[PDB]
Amino acid sequence: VARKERGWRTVFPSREFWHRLRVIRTQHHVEALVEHQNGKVVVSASTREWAIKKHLYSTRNVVACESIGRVLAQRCLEAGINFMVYQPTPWEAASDSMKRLQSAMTEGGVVLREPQRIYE
Amino acid sequence: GSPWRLLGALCLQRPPVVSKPLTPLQEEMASLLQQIEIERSLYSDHELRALDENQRLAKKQDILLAQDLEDMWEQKFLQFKLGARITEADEKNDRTSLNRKLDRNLVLLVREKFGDQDVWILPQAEWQPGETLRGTAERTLATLSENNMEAKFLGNAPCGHYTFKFPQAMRTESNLGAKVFFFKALLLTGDFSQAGNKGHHVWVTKDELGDYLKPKYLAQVRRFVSDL
Amino acid sequence: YKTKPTHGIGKYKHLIKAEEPVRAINLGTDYEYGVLNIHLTAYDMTLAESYAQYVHNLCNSLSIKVEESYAMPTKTIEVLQLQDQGSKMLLDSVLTTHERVVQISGLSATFAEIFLEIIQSSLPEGVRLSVKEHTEEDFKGRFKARPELEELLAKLK
Amino acid sequence: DSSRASLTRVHRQAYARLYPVLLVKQDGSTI
Amino acid sequence: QGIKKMEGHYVHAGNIIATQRHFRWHPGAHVGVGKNKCLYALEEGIVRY
Amino acid sequence: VELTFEETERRALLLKKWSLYKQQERKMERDTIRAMLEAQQEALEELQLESPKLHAEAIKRDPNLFPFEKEGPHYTPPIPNYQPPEGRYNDITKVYTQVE
Amino acid sequence: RRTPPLGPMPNSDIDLSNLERLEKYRSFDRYRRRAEQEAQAPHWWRTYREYFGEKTDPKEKIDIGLPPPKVSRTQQLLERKQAIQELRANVEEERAARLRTASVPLDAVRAEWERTCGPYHKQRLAEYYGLYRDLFHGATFVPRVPLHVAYAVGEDDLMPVYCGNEVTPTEAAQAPEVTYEAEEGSLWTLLLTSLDGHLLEPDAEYLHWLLTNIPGNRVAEGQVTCPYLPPFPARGSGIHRLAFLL
RNA sequence: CAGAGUGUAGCUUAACACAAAGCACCCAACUUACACUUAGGAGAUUUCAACUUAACUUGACCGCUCUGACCA
């Protein structure tokens, strides 16, 4: 019943959400974030932290992206986060590294679409 | 005038005559590229000619076959003897001939005598009023002994400078030292005559360039002399 | 709003090249050559296409504007050999000459000494290099010959 | 070095196989 | 055409904020845009630019 | 033909050593250019201090430079005494002409 | 009429003279990355952050927690580099990562995470849930000591209490099992509060459990200052949040 | 030759610690080519000590740079 920040139809990305999955992949590392529409970050998973880096051959490959989703899904359930939107670009969504990060998040129990707001 | 003499030096180069040998890694990769080029190519007219004959021969008016014709080609190849990439000057190690070390680039060195002492340097000529600094380098070739060579000069700017001082013996307020500016050129065609060869000059790769030059003179020549 | 201090914050067209609808040839200053055509002719079509692709990427690394990268018409050449103990020329082989061009503008006088020595060093075997200044003649050499215009021109004479 | 851009393959989707040969010139040289 | 609700004005859901033929003003938070680039309020509150 | 697991394993591992080998070729070429340019610019400075009249001529372009022609190396050098066979060169390049 | 800007304008640094010799963006992701940087910067003009952004105080929130551990960065970094070399030397890890069949053990990732950067994540999460604001009026602390709570549901199952996971009052009818690493001779104090459960006063909270002067890890030995009382969130009142403080 | 100056892989006033980051760069595929994108690759604190955190501060040890000695 909480209002979503509707609007922003002429720009990218949208704001009509409560929680958002944002993926940041650099030349060396991969980072996934769950943040609120107000900007605050709830939970995160990066390849910079020893916990995940000590088990990966390459922090920048597809496997790393698939493993960041398995670690993030486990952390989102603990935090209580079960729904969130994902706003990728056409080339990011078609990539095999983002296709495996979504599948890993769903297999963890996270749904990549938020339920519709109740107005009445 | 100034207390620094102006000298127009020359860096004449003989670029490679032959291709450089492939390294162990380049060999492994070149065999793969030719293997990948085959697996992704259509049958050539010479492959379709051989396949058809195989069927016609198996079933049972082409006089010459495909495999038969290949043998003719190979025979002529084995009869032709290729030029030697390694010459007699590489075995004799005659550093005065252009023909040696065809794969690598060569630099010219002439020995001059200063203060009753022999020193290896690049050809150089003192500047004269009414002349560009490069024009002084173009003149050096003419001063060379019995030389028939056409050099192609690259631009007008110098590719290097070296400054030295007389060791307190010839030092004067009028003359303190010298300042040489080098200009690169390419040896299109030509070579020296057979009159005087050994004591005059040598053609040396950048690796073996130190043996002749001095430590300080060498460091300034190894900056614009590439070995790519 | 025009009276407000934040007026003009949305201006963007002064950051974009003026594109308001063949090409006048740039002629070099005393200090910089205007335009140049780098021709790479080779009997093999892969070596010209690869050396051209190397020069195009090298010029970018060196911050040199590559105006245009194109190809020139192929020239097929029949090679006849004198038959063994005879007088008739028999077809021996067919050689194709392949040419690629890389058009650059904005080369400094001092730097050309360097850029030239780099490309000629990395020049493959069987590939020829020719760097010429651009002229309308070259540009008109890439178009089909109009013979109708040549007959009409003769009639006027 | 001559080998900087020499190692290549035909970059075409459809093309007939080509074989490597030596093109002896009028002065004895080869490529 | 033009602004119907200026800075600081109170609006109700559905109220048209601005009309325009070209995008002079863009829709922000809780502001919708129709076919004809008409900006309307999606929530009750204060208008801000 | 299908490629054996050992083959693709060898090819893939060969393209990983080839990406690092070409990274060193470009490093040497990048450094060589820097050395050349740093020596040229530094020599021009020393030339300005000595005589600014000569520095104004060196920085000028050389119209005699272009056209600049250069042939690539060979695989084997020329033979001193080699006589080629007799023949003829005949162009068969299709001429394209624009009508209309 | 014109008024001069109150500060530097956005694109003033750009030089328009050599506009043809400037590096462009050439990509939408490279412009988007710069556009996000300048959107999170302070500006003299009106911004969305001014009217909607969560107002904060300039007085940095004080820290009331334990001191951080002291670690040798040089000796730490040396050991980590060595382990990566061993992992990368094995050709079976390279082959699995190239065929896309490798995977990380989720159980080992969480044990090292709880040691290194879990406390800072739990802090970031508590700030999002508004615990420091309500409990300590803005003062923060890093939970250096991992607190493992779990409710016994039946005889074989356990409902772990993490940081915001849903738990029912039926599973939380009996006191949970509490474990935490502590040295001998130390004294602790546990606490359970309902931040939103209160029925009469908004600001106040309900005390559900209070154990004082606990020796080490043995929670039973600790004095029972307030017995355990299960959560009782009223119907139609929403979702409440109960916190265990150590 | 001493004299001073200087110190993270190419750049950086990246580095509170939770951690050696970000960009630039290299190969392949797409592209006439470039570019974009995808999928991959290589990487650094000059070295020892200093009560420890020390890439950071104090010392030398190391190379680099600059000014003369040296110099055809």
Ligand SMILES: [K+]
């Ligand atoms: K309440």
